[PDB]
Scaffold this motif. Structure first.
Motif, PDB file in Angstrom:
ATOM      1  N   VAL A  77      58.166 -19.771  85.056  1.00  0.00           N
ATOM      2  CA  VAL A  77      58.155 -19.375  86.368  1.00  0.00           C
ATOM      3  C   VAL A  77      59.218 -18.400  86.628  1.00  0.00           C
ATOM      4  O   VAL A  77      60.462 -18.425  86.136  1.00  0.00           O
ATOM      5  CB  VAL A  77      58.241 -20.487  87.400  1.00  0.00           C
ATOM      6  N   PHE A  78      59.077 -17.156  87.517  1.00  0.00           N
ATOM      7  CA  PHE A  78      59.979 -16.139  87.855  1.00  0.00           C
ATOM      8  C   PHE A  78      60.966 -16.374  88.862  1.00  0.00           C
ATOM      9  O   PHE A  78      61.982 -15.505  89.190  1.00  0.00           O
ATOM     10  CB  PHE A  78      59.056 -14.680  88.140  1.00  0.00           C
ATOM     11  N   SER A  79      60.917 -17.518  89.716  1.00  0.00           N
ATOM     12  CA  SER A  79      61.878 -17.727  90.808  1.00  0.00           C
ATOM     13  C   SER A  79      61.823 -16.651  91.873  1.00  0.00           C
ATOM     14  O   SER A  79      60.962 -16.266  92.220  1.00  0.00           O
ATOM     15  CB  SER A  79      63.272 -18.178  90.243  1.00  0.00           C
ATOM     16  N   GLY A  80      63.193 -15.715  92.162  1.00  0.00           N
ATOM     17  CA  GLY A  80      63.257 -14.952  92.939  1.00  0.00           C
ATOM     18  C   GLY A  80      64.267 -15.125  94.173  1.00  0.00           C
ATOM     19  O   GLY A  80      64.686 -14.394  94.721  1.00  0.00           O
ATOM     20  N   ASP A  81      64.811 -16.655  94.315  1.00  0.00           N
ATOM     21  CA  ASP A  81      65.975 -17.104  94.854  1.00  0.00           C
ATOM     22  C   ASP A  81      67.140 -16.889  93.813  1.00  0.00           C
ATOM     23  O   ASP A  81      68.328 -16.209  94.437  1.00  0.00           O
ATOM     24  CB  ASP A  81      65.787 -18.379  95.274  1.00  0.00           C
ATOM     25  N   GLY A  82      67.229 -17.064  92.721  1.00  0.00           N
ATOM     26  CA  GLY A  82      67.901 -16.523  91.568  1.00  0.00           C
ATOM     27  C   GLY A  82      67.017 -15.726  90.960  1.00  0.00           C
ATOM     28  O   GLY A  82      65.844 -16.226  90.850  1.00  0.00           O
TER      29      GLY A  82
END
Lengths: 49, 41
Positions: free
Chosen positions: A1-6
């Motif tokens: 999964v790529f997250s995006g919050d970090g």
């Protein structure tokens, strides 16, 4: 999964049904003040001659 | 001969001051989406 919050890829276990990084932030502020002041003066005078 | 003369007085003053200030502030906010540092800000 790529997250995006970090901004980093992470690896999930095969077991977990879902893991997600959508943010929610909820803030509640309550401020309440009172200031009170009283001042009093009295004078009395009595005289004779 | 006999004479008498007399006088008498009574007096008062008062003063007052008063103040009362009262305030309330409230905020409620929700954010969805974004990244936690800026969403916090």
């Amino acid at each position: 999964v790529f997250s995006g919050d970090g901004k980093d890829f992470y690896r999930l276990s095969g077991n977990v049904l879902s893991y997600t990084f959508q943010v929610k932030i909820n803030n509640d502020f309550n401020y309440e003040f009172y200031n009170s002041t009283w001042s009093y003066v009295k004078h009395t005078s009595t005289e004779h001659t | 001969t006999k004479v008498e003369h007399r006088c008498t007085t009574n007096k008062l003053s008062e003063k007052h001051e008063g103040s009362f200030i009262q305030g309330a502030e409230k905020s409620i906010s929700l954010i969805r989406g974004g990244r936690s540092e800026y969403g916090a800000a």
